[PDB]
Structures are given as structure tokens and as C-alpha cells.
Amino acid sequence: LKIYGVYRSRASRPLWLLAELDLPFEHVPVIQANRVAHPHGPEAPLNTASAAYLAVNPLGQIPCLEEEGLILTESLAITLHIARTQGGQLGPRSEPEDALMVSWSLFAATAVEPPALEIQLIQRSGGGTSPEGQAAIAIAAERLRRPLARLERHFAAEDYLVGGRFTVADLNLAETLRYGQAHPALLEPFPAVAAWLDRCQSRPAFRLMMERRAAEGHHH
Amino acid sequence: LKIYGVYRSRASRPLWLLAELDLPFEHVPVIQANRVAHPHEAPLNTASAAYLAVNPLGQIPCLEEEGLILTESLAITLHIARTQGGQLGPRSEPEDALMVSWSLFAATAVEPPALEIQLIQRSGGGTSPEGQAAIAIAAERLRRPLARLERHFAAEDYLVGGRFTVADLNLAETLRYGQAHPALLEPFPAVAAWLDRCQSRPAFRLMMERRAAE
Amino acid sequence: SLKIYGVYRSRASRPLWLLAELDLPFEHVPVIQANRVAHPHGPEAPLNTASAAYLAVNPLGQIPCLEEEGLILTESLAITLHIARTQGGQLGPRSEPEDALMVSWSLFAATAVEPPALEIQLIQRSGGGTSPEGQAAIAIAAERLRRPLARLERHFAAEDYLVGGRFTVADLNLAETLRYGQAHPALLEPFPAVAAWLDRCQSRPAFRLMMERRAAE
Amino acid sequence: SLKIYGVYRSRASRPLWLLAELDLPFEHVPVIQANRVAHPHGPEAPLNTASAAYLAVNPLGQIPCLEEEGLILTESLAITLHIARTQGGQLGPRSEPEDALMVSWSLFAATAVEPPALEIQLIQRSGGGTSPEGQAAIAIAAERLRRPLARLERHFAAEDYLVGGRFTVADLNLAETLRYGQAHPALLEPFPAVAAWLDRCQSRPAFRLMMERRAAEGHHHHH
Ligand SMILES: N[C@@H](CCC(=O)N[C@@H](CS)C(=O)NCC(=O)O)C(=O)O
Ligand SMILES: N[C@@H](CCC(=O)N[C@@H](CS)C(=O)NCC(=O)O)C(=O)O
Ligand SMILES: N[C@@H](CCC(=O)N[C@@H](CS)C(=O)NCC(=O)O)C(=O)O
Ligand SMILES: N[C@@H](CCC(=O)N[C@@H](CS)C(=O)NCC(=O)O)C(=O)O
């Protein structure tokens, strides 16, 4: 089992999951090409533009999973696969539970990640220091209103997405939401959602993943 | 087995699959609220309290089947294909994994740009010079994923297992959004050939005929 | 002397209307929008905004355009102001201050009114605006017009025209930019004073004459 | 007396720049955008676009606005032309034809350049390509500016200024609308003559001074 991608990327999803498990694996750090001066260079560290990596993931993105006879792209698919084959109770007990996890993951990828990622970039870019950046964050937050309200309703009676227990479905949704976490007002209207995200991030494996992510070298 | 949503929506994905499997089901034609003069009498729509009781998110499609309410068009198709799809579903966990992967790729890399092309074409200034420029830009967002598909289809006729599966169906539908753009697939003959293999299927034609009559 | 480029079914309608009001002799050179022509460069293609012969007059490739000896003037609202001011009649400014006012109202028309109104016409032009989705798109544009229209409502509740209490090129310019969204029936329902003003402008013989010729193309 | 409403950090920069060129005495009345004030109708709110007292001057609630004896004039580009014509000397029109050209160039600036350029400015202020929609919006705006810029490149291939071979309010007006998209990378790469023209207008002492004022503008509260 090999996982390609640095902690400071969507590879954080499968890395967090593996941290939840007592499973050895090979971590192949691959950096985003834009963070490397001469990515094509014969002496450049393995990155998303490296020919050697494109032979693994033709799309040139991280993360990517490679096992004996299987190459899998898409962070949320990678985690679901790992959870169902190596994750024990973090994986689905039945096909309907698996379907629910796939559904929550697609919900996370299509309804939550885009607007949340937008908030993250406005913030990191420094754009949030202008009235325009602030207005833009509010517009992105409005795109998240329906998804967040639906989640608030769900967490009114449940502590987790599926089966009354933390599963890869929570991990997957929590990671997409992490992008918009830096905006204080985002979860203010949604206490139950904030409590759930706090519940997921208080886990030892998350803290460990985040500490490893912090210790990772930065590249611009 | 109940499917909520009109043919003229993402419900077309599970509707196409149900046609492929010739499976009986109860179709509940919920329409997008923005297509109704006054959603709040009006036809059952995404803003109807009666529908929000089914899917609080207020979107179609939605599947309901003996103790299971499932949303997300691409998840519904995989679920139906795995439980009653035969060869259209996965033959192993790894195939299932690949199908889920291709679906997320379809939803995150293909659908957003493809949807933008459609939205521009149906807009007031869609056939204007600005419109044509916007579509070309939206189309550029698809170069990376399309080129990647071109490389895959250069060796295989289908996404998984060398046979048509719910994986191809899912991707094929996300791409249909930008199909109205004439030059979209000119640079990608392999993708065009694959898409034609999917849309030449009787079930696809049947779904589109039902969509036209709607 | 005066040559006006552009068909009636375009912004050339503004100077054409004014010329009808003034009854001034001029040469009307029919130039149609390229997108309305098949092979804009064919030997039998009509003179259009993409024609090399026209780009020689207006490099920007747009209509209308005014051409006098020693002056090529683009921008429909500038053309009307120039024609009216030089003719020196009551449709033009009586002083520099009235001229400034007319220029201001013209920029107001060009920036606050034309964009949203044009948007409404385009929506109607496409398959339809009558559809719930089209109506919603039109409502969005009508909302961009609320502040401008409300301000016009306040102005017309005290005056019958924009400047000097008389019909001038300023009224003509504004009326033409607002005509784009006029097809949406409800557009001026909340603004009775504006609708009354628009009626006074469109009731003029010269306006009706311009429209008749427009319908003929 | 001549009153100019609006802060430097707004389109009031247009008449303020012109006024700096002429060194003409006038009363600057600071009026800030309402979205920059917590409680625009509050007792301690600075005069703003939502203030009832300002709406009495300009019903549209926008800056800048000019007020002279018996004249209230809105629209930044009409304001500059009016000042130029009445007290600008050579910065104003020498004849009716020149005046017509200045009005025409101002309308071209307001309709062909300002909208797309502003779109670029707003997206840049918010962070740039912070989403697929943002990158696209910038690319669309840049494409909308292609014809206008190319038309300008042709004009500046033989002239150093828009009208009369000298700096006039026409240049000032167009330059301010283009300033919005100035930072976009390579926007003017294909248009060196346009770029040199903008540099020509912006290297003037009055422009630099206006920008210095714009950068330092603010209210002092003694504590
Ligand atoms: N939808 C994918 C997206 C993966 C992705 O875009 N990854 C980024 C880093 S978070 C990347 O590899 N970008 C660098 C590049 O495209 O060159 C997934 O969730 O796995
Ligand atoms: N990611 C979802 C999106 C579903 C969706 O956005 N559906 C649209 C119709 S195609 C809708 O119900 N919108 C109507 C509304 O929000 O009122 C899926 O793929 O199922
Ligand atoms: N702001 C200008 C705009 C002129 C304009 O865009 N005209 C259109 C016709 S109404 C045109 O010539 N477009 C055809 C083309 O660009 O090829 C004015 O008001 O004169
Ligand atoms: N077309 C006008 C537009 C003026 C305008 O929209 N100004 C902005 C500030 S640059 C404004 O006052 N908006 C703030 C508001 O409406 O509250 C002109 O050029 O004078």
C-alpha cells in the first residue's frame, strides 16, 4: 500500500485515515508542481509534473493510492476504499451503509468543497483584508447555507453522519469543511455542525496528522 | 423503488440506468422550483414542504427504498447498479473502488466546467460574442480532464473492465452538459468515440426520448 | 457634409431619431452588424461592422458612427449631443451648464440604465423570458434598474423632462437606453412618473417615424 | 463656490486629479461609501452615500458629485469635462469638435473600458483567481478589453494623447477607467503604445500627488 502526496494537500484525507489505523504503508511524498522551481528538471524532487508521477496518476494530482494491481485517484475514493478493506468499524457494515458513505462523500465534494475552498483561498491570498474579499467570503458562505443547514438538522439527533459512530464519511466531510474553518462566522449559525467538526478533530489521529502536517517542510 | 425528479435534471442519471436494467420503479416527477411560477396549487417541486420531508436539501434526484433515502445522482446509480445492475455494476471491491473514483472525477473535474457551458448557452447573452468567449474559457477548464480521458480511451474502450458500466454512464452524463458546444471534443477523438458508444445504447436513446416528451 | 453609419435596428436609432426631429439633410449609410450577416466578407455580403471598408471609418467596428469633414465621431449618445448642440435649437443646450447636464444624464443613461435594460432585451430575445426562469433573470435585471428608475421617478414627479422643462437630446438619449427593457410589461409599473415621461417622448411624430422605418428593415 | 463630494478612494479621484492639475480652489466635502460605515444613519457616522443629507444632493447616492451656484452635477466623467471646459485652460476643449471628441472618448471609456476593468479590479482586491469562477471572470473581462485596447494601440501608434496632441481631460478620464485593470498581468503586454500612454499620464506630478493623498486619506480621532 503506497500513498502519494504531501501532508499539505488533499493527501491529508488518506493520511488521517491511516493514522486512525495500526497499518504500515509507504508514504511517497509528492509535491504540487507549482511549489517547485523547475518541476521537469532531472534533479527536481518528485512532483505532480514529474513524468514518473504522471505514469501513476495521468491527471497529475495528489493524492493517489497504489496497491498490488490497483491505482486509485480521488482523495475521497481512496479513503472509502481503505476504510472498507482495512478500516474495521470506520468502514461500512453493509452495502446500504457503503452507499450512504459514497453519497455523503459526493455531497462533500460537490456541495461543500468548492465554496469552502474558495473561502480558504480568499483568506490565504490576503484578499480577505479588503471589503471585496469579505463580501466574497459572505457570498461563498451563502452557497454553504443550504448544505450547512441540512447538516445542522442531521446533527440535531445524531453525533455522526452514519451508524451513530465516527466513520470515513465523517472524515471525508470534515476534511472538505476544514477549508472554510478559518472563517469565524461560517459555523456560528450552526452549533450542532461546529460540535460535530470539533468531535472529529478532537480525535488523536487527527491531531497526529495535523502535527505531522505542521512539521512538514514548506515549499513555495 | 422510488425515484424523485424529472428527466430534465440530474435524475436522468438513475433514469438512464433503470432503463438499462429494465427495472420497474415508481417515478415521482419533482421539478426544480425555479422552473415553477409560484413554487408555493403548484406541482410538487424542490421547494415543496412535502419534498423537503424526503430530501431536506431540496434537490433532485433522490432515491427512496424500504428504509433508505439516498441522495446524490452518482451515488444512486452506483447503488442501483451494485444491487441489481448485473454486469453494469462492479465484479469486485477494487472495481467498485474504481467506479467510485471515476464518479468523483466526473463530479469534480468534468461537471463544473461542463455545466458552465450549458448555463452560458441558455443565458440571454449566450449567442453573443461575449457568450462565445465565455464558453471557450469554460471549455479550457476541461482540457486537462479530457486529455487524460483521451489517453485512457486510447487503450481501452470503457473506463472499467473493458465493458460499459455505471462508471461510463456517470461520466457520460456529466459531460453531456457541455456536449452542445460543437468543438468540445474535436481535439479528443478517443473521447468522442467512447461517448458515442455510450449514447448509441438503446437505453440512452429511450431515456432521451422520454426526456423530450417531458 | 453629414453621414450617419448604421441601420435603424441598432444604436444608430438614436441619431436617426434626432435627425428626424431636426429634419436635417444627411446621408444615411446602411451598415449592419456583422453577426447578422452570413459571410461578412463575401463579394455580395452587405457593408457590415466587419467590412474592411467600414473599419476604415470606425476602427472599433461598431455602429453608429458620424462622419463630417474633419471629424469622425463614434458613441451614439455623443453623436446626438454633437448634432443637437451644433444645430443650436431647443433640443440642444442653451448654455454650457445645460450642456454639462445633458452629458451627465447621457453617462447616467449609458452606465446605470443601458446595461441592465439591454440584459432584459437579450433575455426576451432568447427562447423566452416568459418562462419562470426567464422571468427570474429579468427580475434580477429590473433590480439593477430600481435605484436608477426610483431616482428618475423622483425627478419626473417635479419636472416633465430631464433638463429645462422641455424635450431635449438628453431625454432622447435616456429614452433610447430605456427602450431596451420596455418590452418587459411590468418594468415601469412601480414608476408611474417615469412611464408618463417615456410616453411623452415616444408620442412625438419623429419617434413614430423612426420606428416605422425601423420596422421596415 | 465649487464643492466636490467624495473621498479620494473612489471615482472622486477623477475630479480630484483634475483639480490638482489646475491647482484650483474648491471645497472638498468628504463622503465615504456606506458599506465602509457600520451605522450609516448613526449619530457619529461620517457623511456617506446613504446619509439623508447627502441624498438631498445626489438622489442616486453615489460619489462623486459636483455642486456650484445653480448646478448639481453627478457622473464623474461629466464633472471633469465641466471643470475642464470652464477653468481647465488647455486641458479643456479648444473648439466644439474637440469637445465632442472628449465627450465621445469619455463615453467610450465609461462603456467599453470601465465595466471590464472594474470587474478585474474587484476580483483582484478579493484575492484574484480564488476559484474557477474568479479566474474565468478575469479571463472574460480581459477578452472584453481586447477590441478597446487594440483600437487605442492604433490611435497611439501615431498620437501621444487622445485629442489635440496634448494632455487633456479626455486622457485623464480614459486613464482613470483603465487604472482599474492596470495590475492584471500582461493585460497591456500586447499593447506597448497604450502602456506608454498610461505611463505618460501617470508620471504627471498631479497624478502622483492625487495618489499620495488617496493612500494617506483617513480620519484622526484624538485620544
Ligand atoms: N478531486 C481531487 C483533486 C486533487 C487535487 O486537485 N490535488 C491538488 C493538491 S490538493 C493538486 O495535485 N494540484 C497540483 C496540480 O494540479 O499540479 C481529489 O480530491 O483527489
Ligand atoms: N450533487 C447533486 C446535485 C443535485 C442538484 O443540484 N439538482 C438540481 C436539479 S439538476 C436541483 O434539484 N436544484 C433545484 C433547487 O435547488 O431548487 C447530485 O448530483 O445529485
Ligand atoms: N457604446 C456604443 C456601442 C455601439 C455598439 O456596440 N453597437 C453595436 C450595434 S447596436 C455594434 O456595432 N456591434 C456590432 C459589432 O461589434 O460587430 C455606442 O453607444 O455607440
Ligand atoms: N457612473 C458613476 C458611478 C459612481 C459610483 O457608483 N460611485 C461609487 C463609489 S466609486 C458609489 O458611490 N457607490 C457607493 C454606494 O452606492 O453606496 C460615476 O462615474 O460618477
mmCIF file of C-alpha atoms in Angstrom, chain C:
data_model
loop_
_atom_site.group_PDB
_atom_site.id
_atom_site.type_symbol
_atom_site.label_atom_id
_atom_site.label_comp_id
_atom_site.label_asym_id
_atom_site.label_seq_id
_atom_site.Cartn_x
_atom_site.Cartn_y
_atom_site.Cartn_z
ATOM 1 C CA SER C 1 -21.496 67.106 -45.036
ATOM 2 C CA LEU C 2 -23.179 64.762 -42.524
ATOM 3 C CA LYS C 3 -23.008 60.975 -42.951
ATOM 4 C CA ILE C 4 -24.535 58.523 -40.449
ATOM 5 C CA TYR C 5 -23.437 54.876 -40.491
ATOM 6 C CA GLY C 6 -25.689 52.161 -39.112
ATOM 7 C CA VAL C 7 -29.082 50.534 -39.652
ATOM 8 C CA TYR C 8 -32.206 51.598 -37.767
ATOM 9 C CA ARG C 9 -32.135 48.279 -35.925
ATOM 10 C CA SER C 10 -29.135 49.352 -33.839
ATOM 11 C CA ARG C 11 -27.946 52.213 -31.632
ATOM 12 C CA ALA C 12 -27.894 54.242 -34.831
ATOM 13 C CA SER C 13 -31.592 54.675 -33.988
ATOM 14 C CA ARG C 14 -30.618 57.473 -31.599
ATOM 15 C CA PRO C 15 -29.054 59.877 -34.089
ATOM 16 C CA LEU C 16 -31.632 58.827 -36.696
ATOM 17 C CA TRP C 17 -34.464 59.825 -34.341
ATOM 18 C CA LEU C 18 -32.787 63.175 -33.630
ATOM 19 C CA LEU C 19 -32.243 63.809 -37.324
ATOM 20 C CA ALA C 20 -35.963 63.204 -37.839
ATOM 21 C CA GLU C 21 -36.777 65.727 -35.116
ATOM 22 C CA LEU C 22 -34.477 68.320 -36.669
ATOM 23 C CA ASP C 23 -35.303 67.420 -40.273
ATOM 24 C CA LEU C 24 -31.641 67.882 -41.161
ATOM 25 C CA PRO C 25 -30.316 66.736 -44.552
ATOM 26 C CA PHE C 26 -27.780 63.930 -44.240
ATOM 27 C CA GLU C 27 -26.530 60.781 -45.915
ATOM 28 C CA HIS C 28 -27.615 57.529 -44.317
ATOM 29 C CA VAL C 29 -25.074 54.798 -44.966
ATOM 30 C CA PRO C 30 -26.626 51.405 -44.115
ATOM 31 C CA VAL C 31 -24.116 49.392 -42.098
ATOM 32 C CA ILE C 32 -25.452 46.223 -40.478
ATOM 33 C CA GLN C 33 -23.967 44.241 -37.594
ATOM 34 C CA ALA C 34 -21.599 41.518 -38.821
ATOM 35 C CA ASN C 35 -23.179 38.773 -36.709
ATOM 36 C CA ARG C 36 -26.388 39.335 -38.692
ATOM 37 C CA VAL C 37 -24.569 38.622 -41.979
ATOM 38 C CA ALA C 38 -23.665 35.181 -43.380
ATOM 39 C CA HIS C 39 -20.199 35.668 -44.888
ATOM 40 C CA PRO C 40 -19.408 39.208 -43.642
ATOM 41 C CA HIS C 41 -16.513 39.208 -46.132
ATOM 42 C CA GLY C 42 -18.275 37.823 -49.204
ATOM 43 C CA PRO C 43 -18.320 39.735 -52.528
ATOM 44 C CA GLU C 44 -22.076 40.020 -52.110
ATOM 45 C CA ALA C 45 -22.078 40.467 -48.338
ATOM 46 C CA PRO C 46 -23.512 43.870 -47.380
ATOM 47 C CA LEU C 47 -21.371 46.561 -45.780
ATOM 48 C CA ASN C 48 -21.101 45.476 -42.153
ATOM 49 C CA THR C 49 -19.190 46.214 -38.960
ATOM 50 C CA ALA C 50 -16.535 43.703 -40.036
ATOM 51 C CA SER C 51 -16.044 45.118 -43.545
ATOM 52 C CA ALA C 52 -12.566 46.494 -44.248
ATOM 53 C CA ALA C 53 -14.293 49.483 -45.843
ATOM 54 C CA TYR C 54 -16.112 50.198 -42.590
ATOM 55 C CA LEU C 55 -13.171 49.590 -40.293
ATOM 56 C CA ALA C 56 -11.575 52.422 -42.275
ATOM 57 C CA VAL C 57 -14.239 54.731 -40.827
ATOM 58 C CA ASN C 58 -14.605 53.258 -37.316
ATOM 59 C CA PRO C 59 -11.626 51.075 -36.304
ATOM 60 C CA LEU C 60 -13.624 49.807 -33.331
ATOM 61 C CA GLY C 61 -16.011 48.126 -35.757
ATOM 62 C CA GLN C 62 -19.238 49.368 -34.213
ATOM 63 C CA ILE C 63 -22.266 51.386 -35.294
ATOM 64 C CA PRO C 64 -23.354 54.122 -35.234
ATOM 65 C CA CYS C 65 -20.618 56.420 -36.432
ATOM 66 C CA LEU C 66 -20.799 60.027 -37.592
ATOM 67 C CA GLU C 67 -18.607 61.438 -40.339
ATOM 68 C CA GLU C 68 -18.302 65.141 -41.209
ATOM 69 C CA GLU C 69 -15.388 66.870 -42.912
ATOM 70 C CA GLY C 70 -12.563 66.821 -40.392
ATOM 71 C CA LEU C 71 -14.427 64.755 -37.798
ATOM 72 C CA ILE C 72 -15.243 61.088 -37.277
ATOM 73 C CA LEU C 73 -17.351 60.683 -34.164
ATOM 74 C CA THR C 74 -18.326 57.396 -32.504
ATOM 75 C CA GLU C 75 -20.560 56.735 -29.460
ATOM 76 C CA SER C 76 -24.281 57.086 -30.166
ATOM 77 C CA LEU C 77 -25.007 59.425 -27.248
ATOM 78 C CA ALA C 78 -22.090 61.719 -28.118
ATOM 79 C CA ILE C 79 -23.234 61.863 -31.753
ATOM 80 C CA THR C 80 -26.720 63.035 -30.800
ATOM 81 C CA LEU C 81 -25.364 65.653 -28.401
ATOM 82 C CA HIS C 82 -22.996 66.977 -31.076
ATOM 83 C CA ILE C 83 -25.703 67.169 -33.734
ATOM 84 C CA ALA C 84 -28.202 68.900 -31.446
ATOM 85 C CA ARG C 85 -25.702 71.359 -29.954
ATOM 86 C CA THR C 86 -24.337 72.483 -33.331
ATOM 87 C CA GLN C 87 -27.812 72.886 -34.830
ATOM 88 C CA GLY C 88 -28.457 75.177 -31.858
ATOM 89 C CA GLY C 89 -32.195 74.660 -31.481
ATOM 90 C CA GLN C 90 -34.307 73.970 -28.402
ATOM 91 C CA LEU C 91 -33.415 70.259 -28.471
ATOM 92 C CA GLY C 92 -29.828 71.221 -27.684
ATOM 93 C CA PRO C 93 -28.272 73.003 -24.661
ATOM 94 C CA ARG C 94 -28.905 76.729 -24.216
ATOM 95 C CA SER C 95 -25.692 77.159 -22.220
ATOM 96 C CA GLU C 96 -22.562 75.304 -21.101
ATOM 97 C CA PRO C 97 -24.300 74.377 -17.819
ATOM 98 C CA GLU C 98 -27.225 72.738 -19.665
ATOM 99 C CA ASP C 99 -24.673 71.012 -21.882
ATOM 100 C CA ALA C 100 -22.915 69.629 -18.802
ATOM 101 C CA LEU C 101 -26.275 68.401 -17.522
ATOM 102 C CA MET C 102 -27.040 66.645 -20.793
ATOM 103 C CA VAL C 103 -23.626 64.983 -20.822
ATOM 104 C CA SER C 104 -24.159 63.847 -17.241
ATOM 105 C CA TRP C 105 -27.605 62.417 -17.988
ATOM 106 C CA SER C 106 -26.102 60.662 -21.013
ATOM 107 C CA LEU C 107 -23.380 58.993 -18.958
ATOM 108 C CA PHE C 108 -26.079 58.113 -16.427
ATOM 109 C CA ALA C 109 -28.105 56.538 -19.235
ATOM 110 C CA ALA C 110 -25.053 54.739 -20.641
ATOM 111 C CA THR C 111 -23.812 53.324 -17.323
ATOM 112 C CA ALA C 112 -26.797 52.908 -14.981
ATOM 113 C CA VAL C 113 -29.642 52.194 -17.396
ATOM 114 C CA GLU C 114 -28.427 50.641 -20.657
ATOM 115 C CA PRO C 115 -26.575 47.595 -19.285
ATOM 116 C CA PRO C 116 -29.498 46.138 -17.251
ATOM 117 C CA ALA C 117 -32.068 47.133 -19.885
ATOM 118 C CA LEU C 118 -30.014 45.543 -22.645
ATOM 119 C CA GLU C 119 -29.868 42.440 -20.471
ATOM 120 C CA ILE C 120 -33.658 42.340 -20.299
ATOM 121 C CA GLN C 121 -33.955 42.534 -24.082
ATOM 122 C CA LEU C 122 -31.442 39.720 -24.569
ATOM 123 C CA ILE C 123 -33.378 37.537 -22.124
ATOM 124 C CA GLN C 124 -36.595 38.191 -24.038
ATOM 125 C CA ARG C 125 -34.811 37.596 -27.368
ATOM 126 C CA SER C 126 -33.623 34.148 -26.323
ATOM 127 C CA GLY C 127 -36.122 31.291 -26.240
ATOM 128 C CA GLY C 128 -38.098 33.371 -23.793
ATOM 129 C CA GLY C 129 -38.354 35.422 -20.661
ATOM 130 C CA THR C 130 -41.963 34.348 -20.219
ATOM 131 C CA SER C 131 -40.687 31.124 -18.652
ATOM 132 C CA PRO C 132 -40.337 31.144 -14.848
ATOM 133 C CA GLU C 133 -36.538 31.094 -15.219
ATOM 134 C CA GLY C 134 -36.555 33.879 -17.780
ATOM 135 C CA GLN C 135 -38.801 35.994 -15.584
ATOM 136 C CA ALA C 136 -36.411 35.432 -12.683
ATOM 137 C CA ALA C 137 -33.467 36.590 -14.789
ATOM 138 C CA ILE C 138 -35.469 39.644 -15.859
ATOM 139 C CA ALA C 139 -36.327 40.381 -12.221
ATOM 140 C CA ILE C 140 -32.606 40.381 -11.443
ATOM 141 C CA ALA C 141 -32.039 42.999 -14.136
ATOM 142 C CA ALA C 142 -35.082 45.008 -13.056
ATOM 143 C CA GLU C 143 -33.478 45.109 -9.607
ATOM 144 C CA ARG C 144 -30.319 46.670 -11.072
ATOM 145 C CA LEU C 145 -32.657 49.293 -12.526
ATOM 146 C CA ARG C 146 -34.511 50.029 -9.269
ATOM 147 C CA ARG C 147 -32.171 52.746 -7.930
ATOM 148 C CA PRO C 148 -31.856 54.483 -11.321
ATOM 149 C CA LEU C 149 -35.596 54.277 -12.016
ATOM 150 C CA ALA C 150 -36.512 55.395 -8.485
ATOM 151 C CA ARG C 151 -34.267 58.427 -8.923
ATOM 152 C CA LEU C 152 -35.913 59.192 -12.250
ATOM 153 C CA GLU C 153 -39.299 58.806 -10.561
ATOM 154 C CA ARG C 154 -38.342 61.481 -8.018
ATOM 155 C CA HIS C 155 -37.083 63.769 -10.789
ATOM 156 C CA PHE C 156 -40.153 63.424 -13.021
ATOM 157 C CA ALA C 157 -42.538 63.878 -10.117
ATOM 158 C CA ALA C 158 -41.423 67.514 -10.277
ATOM 159 C CA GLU C 159 -40.448 68.023 -13.931
ATOM 160 C CA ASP C 160 -41.833 66.749 -17.237
ATOM 161 C CA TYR C 161 -38.370 66.415 -18.808
ATOM 162 C CA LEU C 162 -34.760 65.956 -17.683
ATOM 163 C CA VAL C 163 -33.451 69.441 -18.472
ATOM 164 C CA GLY C 164 -35.017 72.884 -18.805
ATOM 165 C CA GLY C 165 -38.591 71.641 -18.601
ATOM 166 C CA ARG C 166 -38.570 70.773 -22.300
ATOM 167 C CA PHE C 167 -37.818 67.796 -24.575
ATOM 168 C CA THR C 168 -34.090 67.774 -25.367
ATOM 169 C CA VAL C 169 -31.482 65.360 -26.669
ATOM 170 C CA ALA C 170 -30.954 64.318 -23.029
ATOM 171 C CA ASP C 171 -34.479 62.895 -22.940
ATOM 172 C CA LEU C 172 -33.941 61.284 -26.316
ATOM 173 C CA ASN C 173 -30.715 59.601 -25.188
ATOM 174 C CA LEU C 174 -32.163 58.305 -21.930
ATOM 175 C CA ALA C 175 -35.400 57.161 -23.567
ATOM 176 C CA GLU C 176 -33.494 55.113 -26.109
ATOM 177 C CA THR C 177 -31.404 53.313 -23.494
ATOM 178 C CA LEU C 178 -34.568 52.533 -21.537
ATOM 179 C CA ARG C 179 -36.332 51.248 -24.647
ATOM 180 C CA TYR C 180 -34.249 48.049 -24.430
ATOM 181 C CA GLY C 181 -36.163 46.841 -21.388
ATOM 182 C CA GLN C 182 -39.512 48.374 -22.297
ATOM 183 C CA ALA C 183 -40.766 45.038 -23.647
ATOM 184 C CA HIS C 184 -40.986 43.719 -20.082
ATOM 185 C CA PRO C 185 -44.568 44.884 -19.287
ATOM 186 C CA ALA C 186 -44.091 45.333 -15.532
ATOM 187 C CA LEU C 187 -40.836 47.271 -15.843
ATOM 188 C CA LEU C 188 -42.381 50.671 -15.113
ATOM 189 C CA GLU C 189 -45.420 49.619 -13.084
ATOM 190 C CA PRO C 190 -43.766 50.916 -9.882
ATOM 191 C CA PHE C 191 -42.646 54.094 -11.638
ATOM 192 C CA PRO C 192 -45.722 55.950 -12.985
ATOM 193 C CA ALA C 193 -43.904 59.283 -13.399
ATOM 194 C CA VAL C 194 -41.202 57.612 -15.493
ATOM 195 C CA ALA C 195 -43.784 55.840 -17.643
ATOM 196 C CA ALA C 196 -45.596 59.140 -18.206
ATOM 197 C CA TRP C 197 -42.332 60.758 -19.298
ATOM 198 C CA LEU C 198 -41.450 57.876 -21.615
ATOM 199 C CA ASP C 199 -44.914 58.209 -23.149
ATOM 200 C CA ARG C 200 -44.403 61.923 -23.775
ATOM 201 C CA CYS C 201 -41.134 61.125 -25.538
ATOM 202 C CA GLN C 202 -42.436 58.239 -27.617
ATOM 203 C CA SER C 203 -45.615 60.129 -28.574
ATOM 204 C CA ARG C 204 -43.615 62.561 -30.707
ATOM 205 C CA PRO C 205 -44.103 62.313 -34.505
ATOM 206 C CA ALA C 206 -40.366 61.927 -35.164
ATOM 207 C CA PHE C 207 -40.108 58.951 -32.813
ATOM 208 C CA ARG C 208 -43.007 57.186 -34.501
ATOM 209 C CA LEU C 209 -41.437 57.951 -37.876
ATOM 210 C CA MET C 210 -38.124 56.441 -36.763
ATOM 211 C CA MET C 211 -39.866 53.293 -35.527
ATOM 212 C CA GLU C 212 -41.855 52.869 -38.747
ATOM 213 C CA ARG C 213 -38.608 52.939 -40.739
ATOM 214 C CA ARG C 214 -37.039 50.583 -38.210
ATOM 215 C CA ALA C 215 -39.872 48.076 -38.585
ATOM 216 C CA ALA C 216 -39.377 48.260 -42.356
ATOM 217 C CA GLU C 217 -35.830 46.846 -42.200
#
